[PDB]
């Protein structure tokens, strides 16, 4: 509904602990969906070359995410993937996607364009001074 984070419906017959783990993981998927929406929206030429470049970089990171997901799918096809292993493997991916989504949401809220977008990028880069990744 609108520019809101994607909400998910979980089957009520799922384990409560399973449901909580799912609710803990779903934020990553919401971030992915938001990033894809941002990429597709700001990719219009009208949004300017800076927004185009932002979308391209996001596309590269999305490609990396998709590669990761496909490898996880392969592991699942092997039956070697447990839910706890999934959480462990996704934790770094979860953090990366969350950072990307926070940046996307900030750019979208600010309607940053050109030099204002560059300023926002500088400020965010200082905001991530503590997170080497």
């Amino acid at each position: 509904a609108g520019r809101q984070s994607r909400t998910f419906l979980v089957d009520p017959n799922l384990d409560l602990s399973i449901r909580e783990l799912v609710h803990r993981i779903l934020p990553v998927a919401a971030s992915y969906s938001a990033v894809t929406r941002f990429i597709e929206e700001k990719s219009s030429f009208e949004y300017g070359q800076v927004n185009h470049a932002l979308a391209a970089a996001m596309r590269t990171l999305v490609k990396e995410h998709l590669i990761l997901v496909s490898q996880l799918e392969q592991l699942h096809r092997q039956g070697l993937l447990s839910l706890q292993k999934l959480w462990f493997y996704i934790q770094p991916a979860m953090r990366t996607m969350d950072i990307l989504a926070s940046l996307a949401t900030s750019v979208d809220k600010g309607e940053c364009l050109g030099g204002s977008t560059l300023s926002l990028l500088h400020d965010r880069s200082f905001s991530y001074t503590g997170d080497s990744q």
Binding site: A53, A56, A57, R59, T60, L61, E64, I67, L68, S70, Q71, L72, Q74, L75, L80, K85, Y89
Partner: protein, 65 residues
């Protein structure tokens, strides 16, 4: 490095085909990374079980004490 695999991030991007050979290499690299983490996990599990699996009273660090 995010910029190293940024083939489509550039000023003078040469016209290339859609050839994803580098993409296949990147996929293999990520698969290798995941497999390496899984192998490390499996090795740690095996080592810990093997330590835990010694004969009763065997494997103690203070031999004979």
């Amino acid at each position: 490095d995010y910029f190293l695999n940024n083939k489509h991030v550039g000023r003078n991007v040469p016209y290339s085909g859609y050839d994803c050979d580098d993409l296949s290499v990147f996929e293999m690299d990520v698969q290798s990374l995941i497999s390496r983490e899984e192998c490390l996990c499996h090795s740690m599990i095996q080592e810990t079980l093997q330590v835990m699996e010694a004969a009763p009273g065997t494997g103690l660090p203070t031999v004979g004490l």
